[PDB]
Amino acid sequence: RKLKFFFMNPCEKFWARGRKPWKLAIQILKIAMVTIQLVLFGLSNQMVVAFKEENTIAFKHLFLKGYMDRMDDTYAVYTQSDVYDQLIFAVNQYLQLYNVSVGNHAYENAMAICQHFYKRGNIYPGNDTFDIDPEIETECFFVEPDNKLNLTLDFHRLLTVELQFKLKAINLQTVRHQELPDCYDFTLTITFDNKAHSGRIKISLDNDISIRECKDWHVSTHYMMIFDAFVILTCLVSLILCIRSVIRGLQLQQEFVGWYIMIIISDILTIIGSILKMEIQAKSLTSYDVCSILLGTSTMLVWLGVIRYLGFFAKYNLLILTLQAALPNVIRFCCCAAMIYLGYCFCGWIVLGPYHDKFRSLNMVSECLFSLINGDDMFATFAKMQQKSYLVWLFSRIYLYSFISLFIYMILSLFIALITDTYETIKQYQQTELRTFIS
Amino acid sequence: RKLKFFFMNPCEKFWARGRKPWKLAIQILKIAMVTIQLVLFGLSNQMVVAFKEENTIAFKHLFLKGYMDRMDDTYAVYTQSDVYDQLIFAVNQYLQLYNVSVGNHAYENAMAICQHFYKRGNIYPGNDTFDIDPEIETECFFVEPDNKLNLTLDFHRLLTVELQFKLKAINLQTVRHQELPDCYDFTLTITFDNKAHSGRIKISLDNDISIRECKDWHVSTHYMMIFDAFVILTCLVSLILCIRSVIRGLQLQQEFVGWYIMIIISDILTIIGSILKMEIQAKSLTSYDVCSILLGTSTMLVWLGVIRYLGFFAKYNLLILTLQAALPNVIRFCCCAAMIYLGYCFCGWIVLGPYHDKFRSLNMVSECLFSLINGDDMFATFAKMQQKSYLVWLFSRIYLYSFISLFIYMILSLFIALITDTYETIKQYQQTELRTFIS
Amino acid sequence: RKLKFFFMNPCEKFWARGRKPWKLAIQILKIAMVTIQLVLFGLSNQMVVAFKEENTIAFKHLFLKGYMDRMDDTYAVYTQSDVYDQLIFAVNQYLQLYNVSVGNHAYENAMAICQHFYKRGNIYPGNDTFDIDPEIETECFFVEPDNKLNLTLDFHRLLTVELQFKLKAINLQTVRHQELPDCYDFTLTITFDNKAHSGRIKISLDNDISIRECKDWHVSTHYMMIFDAFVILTCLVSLILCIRSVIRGLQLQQEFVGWYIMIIISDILTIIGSILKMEIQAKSLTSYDVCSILLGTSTMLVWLGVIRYLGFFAKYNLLILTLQAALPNVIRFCCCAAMIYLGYCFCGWIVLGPYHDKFRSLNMVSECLFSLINGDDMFATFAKMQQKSYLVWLFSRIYLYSFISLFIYMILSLFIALITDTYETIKQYQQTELRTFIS
Amino acid sequence: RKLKFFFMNPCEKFWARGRKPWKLAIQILKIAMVTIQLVLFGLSNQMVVAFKEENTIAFKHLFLKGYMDRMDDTYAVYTQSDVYDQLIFAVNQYLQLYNVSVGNHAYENAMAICQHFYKRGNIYPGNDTFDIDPEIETECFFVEPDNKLNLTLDFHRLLTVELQFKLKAINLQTVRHQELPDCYDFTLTITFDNKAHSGRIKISLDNDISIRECKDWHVSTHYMMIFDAFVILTCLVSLILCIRSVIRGLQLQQEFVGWYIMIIISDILTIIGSILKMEIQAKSLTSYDVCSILLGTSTMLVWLGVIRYLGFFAKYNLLILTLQAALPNVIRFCCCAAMIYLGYCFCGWIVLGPYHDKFRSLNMVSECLFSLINGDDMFATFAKMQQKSYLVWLFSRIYLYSFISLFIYMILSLFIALITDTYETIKQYQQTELRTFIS
């Protein structure tokens, strides 16, 4: 009836009729609004972030006694004078920060160093006897920021050492031009671990940074926040056009008795996103990155909306029409064969993985498999050579060609395949009783 | 009629008839002429260029106080004695250039250093108060090239420092053998920026170089320039064979009431190219690289002419026949799905991009997406580890496999697909009323 | 008959009938049991291993007199004072280990250095005469671990030098938390070879490590070993469900007069695997890595069982149905064309391989061919430039494009092809007299 | 007739008949003979070679005054004291070689240094006047190997400096175990060039090495050379079975009024190869690498013979049957589109190539295009940033996506395509009047 025309209607044919074109322009407003919300937001998150990393990487630059000819820090002390060396350099770094550090960041009214010790240790190499107590007692030591350093350390008993402290910084180019909180204290922990007891104590400096606003600001009702609330009003108006889409879906359920479900799921993530960016505006958390992930999932789904827009012009939408069509054999293939993947990762995992990486995480082995699926890594995998067991390397070539095998021969092809097939029927059926009664 | 034979005529069948073969040989002359114009020109642009870069990279070699074990310069001072160190080294570099610099380049009748300052600064860490004035006053200082150095710098207030100066060089192996202007003054600016205020002041030396001809030259009517004017006469004769092609197209419009449109668009870019290389011959600009881009677009289109030449021999031109044929689904797919691309770049852009690069430009994120589209970068993207939020890295794997997913499963396949299909109908229809009335 | 129903029966349709569902749950128990056996085992092998490598890499860190700006150790002495330098550093390393080495590892009641000499040497450069005796006499020297060093070396006559020694270490974080032997003596051999007589004596330190259990342990009937025996009882129960599968196959041979053959081959490798992990539990070998390879082949085949499980749900198993189907043209193509591969490796091998690598192993040349098959290495292969013979580099480009050619044009395509075809008949025959008599 | 049966006969069906099986076993003998000739030969060429490179790389190790934190030597002096520094180090290297050099290689009854000078130079920066004389006079200086060094150099006038000398080495592990000439004098030339006059004088050491046999040898009718003559007799017997194949082809021309043409072209390259390895056995050239290329082309074609062997077993040879079949559209596509390639390289060549590489060779630009065709290099191409002209980088992204575009969208697809099609008719016609009259 007329209901079937309002429902099976064409946006562009709806342009022929009057007083319909208002909804689309509303929706494009939502498009570029959300788009800007991205834009401006991305300045926001990245500027914040990069300042943190900047300041971050540098804190290593002040407090690590040295850096090498290789940029990579993965390397750490062999020496006793090395550790007491890093301690002198860094405690005196606490001291000499006011003078030497070229950054503004200064002490706020303070440091500390933790050392973790073994409850009852015993080592007897002579009789081979080895006695351990699985209890660690942590002694914490406190630094006052302004000279002599007293160090008590026993080498065999050392599992982990750390130091903690938190230094203040207020970001000038951040609060100067735009609105984001200018203070974040970077709470630093530098660490040296014998955790494995091997003779190399693996040193890394790691900083967590917390966002706080200046107690006062005097420089030289925020329209950008009220704009995010007005784009948020665009998003609630979009969840209201998603509520008119939802009553449209309720009317399509009554008549049935979704492109919008995407559109509404979007501006719901955008709505929860706008509320939540209001929320990290209130909280000042600095781990609100999530609020970012939340916010951007929206950007995504809204741009599949960019998909049904261009699809809206041409109207035969074959690219997303065939893709949609055979997604069944697609997902069935992914989750079914992805098992085969898993198993190989395991095989690589118990035999190969000892050999692969110094981090030697199965996660990494999974990743570098899929790396060869991407065509690279053969070069760094083939390169590092077993040579201990001719059987070891022998299997090594056996599987790596086996799997690198089963996908090129097998993986792309099934893909390429069902892809081909439903392209065919797409073009074919382009060239139902429900539509018949609709006619 | 006879008009249809002159029009639907075969170049090689035209060889059977007499006094026709002159136009093609004219056109091959244009082929290898333009080809040479490339050749000789490429010597020209590259020799110039490489000299600039040579001299360039080296200027960093003189005036940067140091270089590291890592080739990469991205790194910069942590220290106050470091900056005054780079200043001493470089001002004394100005001084000691005559003696120490192994290059010819010398002062011409002179340097300077700029420092940009804050209008009204205030920093109060104790009460958390932070006061800034968004106005920068630049003080410029002048160097006379032949000893004492006085430095006035305040650390908190420092946003950017620079130095400028322009040194003279006349390129020997350039003007010696061939004709290109031998003098280019490289106007240098070395810089140290606290622009972010982080504690690392990011140092880079950057040179713009300007081309000028020696006022006099005595060594030991230019035929190479008149050759470029004669190949330019070949190009105007080609725009005249493109005007005979255009009156040929006017006759084909009258009869219709283009391979040439390419041929003429080419030798028009080649003609504007020959005029413009005459033009940077007059101007001596050194940013005439554009004149190069202009010039070479020609090389391009003329070699798609190389395409209809070999196609001219075989005459069934299926490779460019099928490609042409289905370019519709091709461009429709590119610009339609390329949306999907865009959206992902955004998603990566707000959540992932904080994490990806120290430059952290969305441009770069776009680039390294398409990098995985090329099969590499999985290795450097998978490698650098979030580890702050299990949700952060969690999404990280979610999308990177999601998109790396949608294209391998989706991207090549649609491609491979329409490509297959129109190959089929190409071979098929190989194996119209207009042609019928032509018969 | 009824026999044909028990045989051509559906697991999920068997769920409709009663007292059948017990066998599957038995088999899933075997799934996640074996899965855990992996899990726990993988902790085991990797923790052991990584400790060895840790301690390992570091031993180089103590005893190599130096490390460079490049991480790579491939480089070695040019000097006489260099070798006597490495000797001083390392013999004094033996000495100063107790004091300087930050690892626990200590001497156990001792080192030695071997030098291999020429039987009768003669070198006469003046008259060009060159006399050699193909007999090497090895003199071994012994180190007592607690000062003066006397060195006797002749440069021309030096083929290989080594030193051997074995140091004791008991791994704390290994025996502390879980059960694995805590002592492994790393028997070290550091070496300097003039083996080629070139003027660079290629230095590497290499360690073999042997596992031994502490003679006594006092800390602060193993259920994990009895769990591996109980999962081993799961595996024997699985070889007994593989014996019921085998009597099932004997009944299917009688009726015929295998998915299980995989299932049983698996839990046989898992059974020999469980017995053998019991066996390296008895032996304490440290080259039991094989026992790992043995053990994991199981993980593999059992997860192709994960394949017939998900396949068990959907029941039309097309992904493994088409793959199975045309594996004939697959294996025929692999082993047939893989000849063509071989030949190219040879061609590259005699002409190209001189040029390719400093290790210059044909194995490596084979590997980096298949590397370009993976899309990478063009960059490091194209980069290193012949330039001695224009014919040398000329062929160099000839073949590398020739083969890189024959596979892209040829290799993926045949692949993609038969893959396509049997996908078609898979979908077709989805859309026998034996089955007819079964009906 | 019977002639058609001897001709259209099956090797394996010929096994049914008697006294035929002798020819094949002859031919397999040729297979593994030639195979061994490879084998042994490959030892030969590689061992020689690697010794040369060994000794080679090291000569740089003695005579370059320094090496850096970066392995790459591409870098060279900025300084006057640097060049006189390299001279001292290297002339004194000539001196101190007997003592310091850990290699055997010694002087044979001597060095020299060349400096190339400008005929009439004039530099006038003040008035901008620049005068040059395009004539270089080379002064050569001679070194006697056993102390004071006198240096005469003018900086502006310096185009190129070199030094030459040739040092003797007799390769121990080469002549000791097997037969190859043990002496090769490595004639060295180290060089420093201001060739561009830029202020960095690009230093490289380059060695040509010549093979000579020891005048006498006393150690502790060659069967390996007579084996290469006997495998060469296998090759002449193979050119005689290729002459029986050629009279077989003459009989097939008479009956017609080639697999063998390959077989004979092979053992002709193998025959000329065996004669020529006899020939570099006589000549002792050391640039006989060609003799290697000659020799191995054989290995190649003989292993396409490995192709018709396995094809000989199965007998339906579809993999090489379809490949053969549509090679027409294949080669037509390669040489036709490869034009399109060329043109792009040019476009990249005049505009992009200034920017790409410091070597900035169009050859390299061609190579790295085809690199992206291989899926890598996007990372190093996208990375290095124009930033001088927004138009420069703008086109930069324009084309790199344009071409990276036209092949993925276009290149593999046509490929994948004709490959698919003739696979189809291969399988089809598997599932002529000449054969009919043969029947």
UniProtKB/Swiss-Prot annotation, chains A, B, C, D:
Keywords: Cell membrane, Cytoplasmic vesicle, Disulfide bond, Endosome, Glycoprotein, Ion channel, Ion transport, Lipid-binding, Lysosome, Membrane, Transmembrane, Transmembrane helix, Transport. The record marks 244 as: Interaction with phosphoinositides. It is a multi-pass membrane protein. CDD domains: ELD_TRPML3. Residues 13-23 are annotated as: Interaction with phosphoinositides. One of its GO terms (cellular component) is autophagosome membrane. GO terms for molecular function: calcium channel activity; lipid binding; monoatomic anion channel activity; NAADP-sensitive calcium-release channel activity; potassium channel activity; sodium channel activity. Changing residue 73 to N: Abolishes basal channel activity without affecting channel activation by a synthetic agonist. It comes from Homo sapiens. A motif (Selectivity filter) lies at residues 374-377. It comes from the Eukaryota. Pfam families: MCLN_ECD (PF21381), PKD_channel (PF08016). This is Mucolipin-3. Disulfide bonds join 114-140, 183-214. Residues 362-382 dip into the membrane without crossing it. Glycans are attached at residues 99, 127, 150. Nonselective cation channel probably playing a role in the regulation of membrane trafficking events. Acts as a Ca(2+)-permeable cation channel with inwardly rectifying activity. Mediates release of Ca(2+) from endosomes to the cytoplasm, contributes to endosomal acidification and is involved in the regulation of membrane trafficking and fusion in the endosomal pathway. Also permeable to Mg(2+), Na(+) and K(+). Does not seem to act as mechanosensory transduction channel in inner ear sensory hair cells. Changing residue 376 to K: Nearly abolishes channel activity; inhibits starvation-induced autophagy. Changing residue 337 to P: Constitutive active channel; abolishes inhibition by lumenal H(+); increases the pore diameter. It catalyses: Ca(2+)(in) = Ca(2+)(out); K(+)(in) = K(+)(out); Na(+)(in) = Na(+)(out). Changing residue 367 to K: Abolishes channel activity. Channel activity is activated by PtdIns(3,5)P2 (phosphatidylinositol 3,5-bisphosphate). Inhibited by lumenal H(+) and Na(+). The channel pore shows dynamic behavior and undergoes spontaneous, Ca(2+)-dependent modulation when conducting Ca(2+).
